[PDB]
């Protein structure tokens, strides 16, 4: 196979070889012809253990004729073994390149039959398509569109199948047309990649995560695909940074750093906007600063981390605390930021809050109302957000009290009164402080 050295590929090959059907037995059961049985036996002796060569077509015909699951698994295992073998496999790939019918038959066999047989056939097809002559974007797209490949990729319990699929996609990503096919497959099944990234942030799993990161980086190598994936998941950069911080593998960290840099690279559209959004939401600057302080054995990973830190510092140089506050308000997430407790920041941003007919004040009132509606859950994060919103409202009422009338009109006083009866002691204290700042002494 193309990546038969992987543990998942070896396990799939062993599973396929477990269900083995003899060529003579298939011929006896009218599942193959005598010449086809002889060709299958020769191929089995050559690979499973003489090369079939031109006889591989009779073996494929016998496999098609033998619809039994055991025979299909045996044929797939033999094909995978031939692909792994240096002498065999290459001849089959050359024959498929010369005759597109053989390549089409191999693609149809891929991701078909039994799960082990489907995996072995897909690995054989990937190995055949690894050659430049036999490479075909249409065959790769057809194999990816198969339900078996999607099930293997989404098989959380079957980590080996997901790792094999990710490795196959990463290997196919070298060819630009196959790279576009892999990008389309990623756009279709981004949920599997997101789940893998979340699992890595929170072995077979490590290899699968590394393969997924490599595939993501290969897709992001194209600026258009990187720009498309940037808006696909705003938290993807934060998840990648968390996984890189958690993971100690140098290769995984380097791949994550390269993927993060590609999204913020100048080649991708809206590079400055993407970098600013990442730094505002995922705290790219602090994570990069922490990574720079930490020592990394890999020189390439260290250089990538240094470049990412420099990019984050350059992006944050133009940004200010007002941009961070705006991003926090847009994300509706507040955890008692330094600007909330900074008297100078509130004094210098009081006019900004009241600007545009108190647009920021209206947004804060809407966030407080949403938190009050979400106050039934009374989650710790929700309680912290509610307390931060109450503190911001109290500050905006104490300074430039014109916003107090707007808040009262928009039900801010009613929201504060409702929060005054909240079960949480901190929320009740914050609401009482806001009420005291409103009309109290």
């Amino acid at each position: 196979k193309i990546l038969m050295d992987s543990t998942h590929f070896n396990e799939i090959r062993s599973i396929i070889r477990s269900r083995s059907v003899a060529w003579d037995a298939l011929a006896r059961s009218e599942e193959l012809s005598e010449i086809d049985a002889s060709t299958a036996k020769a191929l089995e002796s050559i690979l499973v253990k003489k090369v079939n060569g031109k006889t591989l077509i009779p073996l494929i015909h016998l496999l098609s004729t033998s619809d039994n699951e055991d025979c299909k698994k045996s044929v797939q295992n033999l094909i995978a073994e031939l692909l792994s073998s240096d002498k065999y496999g290459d001849d089959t790939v050359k024959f498929f390149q010369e005759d597109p019918k053989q390549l089409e038959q191999l693609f149809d066999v891929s991701l078909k039959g039994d799960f082990q047989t489907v995996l072995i056939s897909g690995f054989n097809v990937v190995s055949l398509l690894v050659q430049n002559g036999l490479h075909n974007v249409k065959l790769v797209e057809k194999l990816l569109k198969n339900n078996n490949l999607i099930n293997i990729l989404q098989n959380i319990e079957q980590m080996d199948t997901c790792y094999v699929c990710i490795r196959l996609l990463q290997e196919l990503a070298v060819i630009p047309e196959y790279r576009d096919v892999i990008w389309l497959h990623e756009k279709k099944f981004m949920p599997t990649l997101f789940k893998i990234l979340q699992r890595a942030t929170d072995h077979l799993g490590i290899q699968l995560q590394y393969h997924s990161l490599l595939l993501i980086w290969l897709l992001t190598f194209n600026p258009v695909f990187a720009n498309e994936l940037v808006q696909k998941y705003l938290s993807d950069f934060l998840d990648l940074l968390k996984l890189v911080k958690i993971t100690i593998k140098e290769k995984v960290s380097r791949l994550c750093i390269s993927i993060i840099l590609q999204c913020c690279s100048t080649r991708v559209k809206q590079h400055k906007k993407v970098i600013k959004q990442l730094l505002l939401l995922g705290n790219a600057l602090p994570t990069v600063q922490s990574l720079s302080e930490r020592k990394y054995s890999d020189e390439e990973l260290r250089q990538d981390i240094s470049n990412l830190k420099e990019i984050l510092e350059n992006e944050y140089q133009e940004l200010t605390s007002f941009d961070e506050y705006v991003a926090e308000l847009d994300s509706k997430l507040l955890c008692w930021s330094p600007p909330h407790v900074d008297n100078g920041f509130w004094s210098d941003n009081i006019d900004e809050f009241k600007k545009d007919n108190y647009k920021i004040f209206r947004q804060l009132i809407e966030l407080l109302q949403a938190k009050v509606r979400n106050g039934d859950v009374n989650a710790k994060q929700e309680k912290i957000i509610i307390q931060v919103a109450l503190n911001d409202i109290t500050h905006v009422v104490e300074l430039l009290p014109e916003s107090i009338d707007v808040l009262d009109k928009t039900g801010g006083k009613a929201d504060i009164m409702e929060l005054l009866n909240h079960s949480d002691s901190r929320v009740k204290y914050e609401a009482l402080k806001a009420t005291q700042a409103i009309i109290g002494y």
């Binding site: 190598f221 194209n222 390269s258 690279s265």
Partner: peptide
């Protein structure tokens, strides 16, 4: 390898822009 591949694509695009300038 991915970074080098992206550089080759960007380098080819720069040469492609030169062809438009040559045109």
């Amino acid at each position: 390898l991915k970074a080098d591949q992206e550089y080759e694509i960007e380098k080819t695009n720069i040469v492609r822009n030169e062809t438009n300038n040559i045109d």
